[PDB]
């Protein structure tokens, strides 16, 4: 969960809305087991 703390502070003549992109990945110790057929296709 991402919470606003304080507030988004901007000078004059600066755009008031911004964005955040999130990047997920596995770690070094991640492992995969058995097998299956994807339901995506």
């Amino acid at each position: 969960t991402i919470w606003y703390q304080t507030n988004f502070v901007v000078p004059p003549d600066t755009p008031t809305e911004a964005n955040i992109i999130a990047l997920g990945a596995a770690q070094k110790n991640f492992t995969l087991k058995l097998c299956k057929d994807t339901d995506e296709i």
Binding site: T1, T14, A25
Partner: protein, 48 residues
């Protein structure tokens, strides 16, 4: 994600994950955020 597309080929995955955030706003903008994580058993927080 790529990690979530290959996990659909297998039945069971186990391990630890990673998440990264990039703030895209202006160079002049200043603020602060709070990023929290909850264990699998607990319900999510209702207040910061």
């Amino acid at each position: 994600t790529m990690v979530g597309q290959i996990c659909r080929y297998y039945t069971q995955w186990s391990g630890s994950l990673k998440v990264t955030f990039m703030f895209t706003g202006s160079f002049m903008a200043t603020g602060k955020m709070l990023i929290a994580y909850t264990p699998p058993g607990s319900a999510q927080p209702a207040t910061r």
